[PDB]
Ligand binder design. Sequence first.
Ligand SMILES: *[C@@H]1O[C@H](CO)[C@@H](O[C@@H]2O[C@H](CO)[C@@H](O)[C@H](O)[C@H]2NC(C)=O)[C@H](O)[C@H]1NC(C)=O
Ligand SMILES: *[C@@H]1O[C@H](CO)[C@@H](O[C@@H]2O[C@H](CO)[C@@H](O)[C@H](O)[C@H]2NC(C)=O)[C@H](O)[C@H]1NC(C)=O
Ligand SMILES: *[C@@H]1O[C@H](CO)[C@@H](O[C@@H]2O[C@H](CO)[C@@H](O)[C@H](O)[C@H]2NC(C)=O)[C@H](O)[C@H]1NC(C)=O
Ligand SMILES: *[C@@H]1O[C@H](CO)[C@@H](O[C@@H]2O[C@H](CO)[C@@H](O)[C@H](O)[C@H]2NC(C)=O)[C@H](O)[C@H]1NC(C)=O
Lengths: 525, 527, 278
Amino acid sequence: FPEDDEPLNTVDYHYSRQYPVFRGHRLDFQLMLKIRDTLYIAGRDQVYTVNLNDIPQTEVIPSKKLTWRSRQQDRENCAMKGKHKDECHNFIKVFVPRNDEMVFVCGTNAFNPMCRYYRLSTLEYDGEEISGLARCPFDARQTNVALFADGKLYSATVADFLASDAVIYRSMGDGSALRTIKYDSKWIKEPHFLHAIEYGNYVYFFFREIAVEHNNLGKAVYSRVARICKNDMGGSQRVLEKHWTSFLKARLNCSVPGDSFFYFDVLQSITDIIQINGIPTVIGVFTTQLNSIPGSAVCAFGMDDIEKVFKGRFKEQKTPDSVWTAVPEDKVPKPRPGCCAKHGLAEAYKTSIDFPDDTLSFIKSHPLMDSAVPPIADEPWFTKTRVRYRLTAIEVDRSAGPYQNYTVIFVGSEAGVVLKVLAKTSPFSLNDSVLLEEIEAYNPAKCSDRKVVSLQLDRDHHALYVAFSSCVVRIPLSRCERYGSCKKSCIASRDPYCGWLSQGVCERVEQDTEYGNTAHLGDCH
Amino acid sequence: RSFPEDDEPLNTVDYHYSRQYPVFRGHRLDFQLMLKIRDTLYIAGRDQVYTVNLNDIPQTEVIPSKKLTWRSRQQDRENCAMKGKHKDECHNFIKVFVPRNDEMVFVCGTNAFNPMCRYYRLSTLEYDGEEISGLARCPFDARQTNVALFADGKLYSATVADFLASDAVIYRSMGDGSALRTIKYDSKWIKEPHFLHAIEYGNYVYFFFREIAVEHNNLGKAVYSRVARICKNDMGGSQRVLEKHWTSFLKARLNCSVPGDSFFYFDVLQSITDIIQINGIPTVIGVFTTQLNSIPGSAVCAFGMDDIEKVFKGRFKEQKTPDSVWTAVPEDKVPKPRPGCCAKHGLAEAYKTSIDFPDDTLSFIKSHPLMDSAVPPIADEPWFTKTRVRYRLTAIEVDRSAGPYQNYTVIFVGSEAGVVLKVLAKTSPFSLNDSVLLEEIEAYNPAKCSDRKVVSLQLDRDHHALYVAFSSCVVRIPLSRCERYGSCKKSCIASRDPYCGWLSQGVCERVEQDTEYGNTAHLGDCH
Amino acid sequence: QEAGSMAGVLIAGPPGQGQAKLFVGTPIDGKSEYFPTLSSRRLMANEEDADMFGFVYQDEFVSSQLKIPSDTLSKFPAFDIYYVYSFRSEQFVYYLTLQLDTQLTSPDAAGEHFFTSKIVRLCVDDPKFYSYVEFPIGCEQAGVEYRLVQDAYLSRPGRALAHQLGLAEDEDVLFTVFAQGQKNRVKPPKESALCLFTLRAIKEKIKERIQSCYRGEGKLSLPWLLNKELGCINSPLQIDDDFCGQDFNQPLGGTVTIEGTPLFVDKDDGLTAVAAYD
Ligand SMILES: *[C@@H]1O[C@H](CO)[C@@H](O[C@@H]2O[C@H](CO)[C@@H](O)[C@H](O)[C@H]2NC(C)=O)[C@H](O)[C@H]1NC(C)=O
Ligand SMILES: *[C@@H]1O[C@H](CO)[C@@H](O[C@@H]2O[C@H](CO)[C@@H](O)[C@H](O)[C@H]2NC(C)=O)[C@H](O)[C@H]1NC(C)=O
Ligand SMILES: *[C@@H]1O[C@H](CO)[C@@H](O[C@@H]2O[C@H](CO)[C@@H](O)[C@H](O)[C@H]2NC(C)=O)[C@H](O)[C@H]1NC(C)=O
Ligand SMILES: *[C@@H]1O[C@H](CO)[C@@H](O[C@@H]2O[C@H](CO)[C@@H](O)[C@H](O)[C@H]2NC(C)=O)[C@H](O)[C@H]1NC(C)=O
């Protein structure tokens, strides 16, 4: 079992308040998206723009601003519904551009979710309102996902004010409204959704939920990967009418090896498809259960290894009081459940409504694959276990280093600390992952609960915008000045963003980031 | 209701503050266990068992009074070298030292991985008599644990039986009966266990150990905490089922958990105490950690004899199909009489010996030797935890009557990193709000000793001292340190140490005070 | 295939217009995806029309429907609601159902399933089915339990029993017949009782449990219809007698079984049907 890494350099409060923060009554930050050289910040009542080309002064000053407050009668229906005044505000929770001009926006609207279309150029409310049901959450504190692929919108949230029905819902297209089976604990039981990604014929989803394979003990939480066909049109009249017919989900294996494999099963956040060492990977941040010993890990998977699981064997509960076991290879009905009509093992099917009743009624009572998805290279890439705080936000730079062949991962925290880690990905790269810098990134003065919510890489300006619950802090990717003259301190940090020049100063991009030898280096004081 | 955090020590004691303490050493000392009779501490190490007079107040180093010398014979040493174990191992590590009466002591050594047992007189540590074979009474390896105890004239051992270290057994022999044993290589009765402690209660002897579990088989290979049971009067089964084998062998599971939405179990047992009267009810107090391959956490749970006894009159546990979940044995399927109830008592009182049990009941407890129920703790949540730190808790020892009025319980636990925690424990509803970690001491002496792993402890109430044992050294550690506060009236009473008290003379001495709450009300800062 | 497990009433709307709503409840034998266990379908004057038996409010989220959760059938297999009587009263419609007990019955379907009789009430003017409410019913006399509903008739009590109960001449009364116990149902034991419930006392214990909710005390308790232990949300709303629910605090669970006034017991030759008038 490994041990906490030691930060090569620490950036404490005094060395970090020299960084700009965003505000604009408070802010109540929700999410952020980078388009071109502009970063969009959506929160309560407001959506803010910061131009990433303007080097900030004491504060980050917003340029353009979008405003969309909840209606008056919506503000009073919310009060009658018992919810407090601070909550009865329009918290923006969805912000996905459909094309290169217009952006799909949804807000909580004081627990009365609605959706709209805005233009990027102007941020003007143009057109007419659409209902946000099954698309945008009721509570601001809930998680949610939202994406556009091939004409149609793929949402994933809660649909009712009472917060019972969690659903994945496709609409806003030329097809009908497909959805998950309400209350069907075998399909989804008390989940918190976190992300989604289009790849091949499928939209792969990432969330956490209560696990049904570890029910013979406490109410555990397992990290799941689910998938759906894009060209699903629902089932026939008998089985899965208007319901998905392509719903397979698997479990994620984040394992410390040993005589008692140790698992991290709470998923906190994940990234998009990143090319690491030639193969498409997804990098995610895992913690332990709430009523457990605080511990955190970063596991990484690949699209290949996700797909392999789904052609593997299905999982069944033979009898109520038996263990989840494999489905016999002979009992997998033809055509391959999960396979998309007109493709692969079902190309003799024009639509998803043509599927046999036995193929449909199999996926409705065996939606969970057997196999778990392996993480690349067995054990996690980084662990931090001895400390009082949990890990949160993740961000990745696939092309870090002067040669752009080094994977530097940036991760958030609960106690306002951010870790910058050079990850050992391939075998021929390092001995193991090294914790480069520990940056306390929470500015007590400008902010307040100090929870980092998400991050967004501004690779074109060598920065990272750390997000908190009421403030957003612009953090450079390298404090190469903290060392400056001291060549020892410099290249001994092994930070690929820094280095040593023949001018005799530690700057950015001669360096040795691989081993980090202290040979022929003196000793500053 | 959620998850505890690491308590803050009310007072700390660094190495400089405790190098001011007498130690004991001696050729490297290879301590294994200690035991206190009257005013004399026997200490067993490599080749040697030393005695220390506890009335003798030490000056700078605890010097031994008498000693007992018993080394491995030349032939035993070459066979142990021939077998291919290192010469550092081919010594006579004492591992058993158990008084039978008030004159004699049953002494067993490892004898270079060829276990032998002898009798000595106590008063003179003199070899009086002849050698008894030590097989399945003393272990082969000094790194393995072992349990031994005498009860009604019969010797109850627990260890491994073979050089190859594969036959973990529980044995009785040297009686007025003959030789009962558990079933060899039976991954159902007991599977690669490490035995910790045993106690004799009522009609049965109870055992406490850890072993590879079988209900947690769907995930990984993990160890659970067990409590077992055998009848004192058990004579073995008939000639068909359990001939010369235990018949009253029942084991159950220890539930050391943190309540919540997702219960967190401490399943790995590190040590435990003897029966202690904690507030009316007979209690045992265990030190529990988490798995080896896990994030280090440590806990101290405490169970009651009533709570253990209950789980064995409770339901049995079975596994229907090899690929099904472990299940409760139905009430109408238990044979008669009640399996695990001793002959001539309660339910087997129409049975003279255990050799009269039916084949219905003999073959049942042969294949259903584990109870369904788990033993819950008292207060249903541990009495103390330690998580956010890098070490594990080992040794345990309690003071059942601390304070001027003796109505408070203090608990003394060791650690791997050579640290010892002093906890005033909450044992009843009307006590404190939570159990408060008093002193934290670094007992280990780097200059005088050597991996610095604290092995076992032993309270010496009368001399207000706790001797603290390591592998290469034993350290004599005074309990209190009232002198550290001197005249600072605040420090003395807000330390809430029941040993320390405030006197009219204006100084903090042993045994006026307030250990209950600790109001630093009306008190001023000391410099 | 059984009869007598279905019940309902027709309610023609405003005259001149061919619509008549029709509220119907029936068991479904676990086929919750095909058939709702309770709906509010529509009637039309032209019988061939395909809009017949169509729900009077339909969208992708809530409809004048009430499907059994796919979850509840998994926790216990052959759960079902049998619908005995149904009657129009004031501006509402009430049903007397008999469901499988989610509590007194283990998930194991050995055959020891106990049952629980319950009134149910909706509004005629509740398109989204928010006004739903469900209280257990029964009675006792001399410590004999009667909790297996058998038949019911809504009658005006005339002038005698009215002034006997303090009810106005327009207030109605429901006579009931309960079989002893909560066991077996398919062939209940002979011991049966003719009990009385006042329509007043039921409208009261309703405005009392839904006034108790809109204050935030306790929680809605329908273990079969709701699954997740949702709590009673607090709210600054003043309940009427004719309050037809809102998007929260519904469907609302009944905590204390409404007790009835026993009128007659027969321990030898069982009671089956009932009716009354003045
Ligand atoms: C989770 O990942 C680990 C890491 O590979 C798996 O452990 C190995 O499983 C293979 C399967 O045959 C064994 O041959 C190896 O010996 C295992 N590793 C070690 C170190 O022993 C583990 O099986 C995975 N678990 C799940 C549920 O997917
Ligand atoms: C990442 O790129 C750097 C730069 O090309 C690699 O390091 C160099 O490797 C070449 C050939 O392998 C050597 O000739 C240079 O001497 C190396 N330079 C330094 C500064 O080390 C590095 O090996 C690459 N890493 C991976 C994993 O491919
Ligand atoms: C371990 O002990 C805890 C503490 O009592 C048990 O938790 C209780 O379990 C019972 C039934 O098992 C429930 O009725 C109680 O509500 C639980 N108490 C709390 C505070 O949640 C736990 O079940 C025990 N587990 C085992 C395996 O014995
Ligand atoms: C343990 O004993 C102490 C001392 O007898 C008790 O504490 C005292 O109780 C008396 C009588 O109620 C009070 O008047 C004193 O003020 C208390 N003094 C102190 C220092 O505690 C204590 O209540 C006993 N605890 C239990 C659980 O019985």
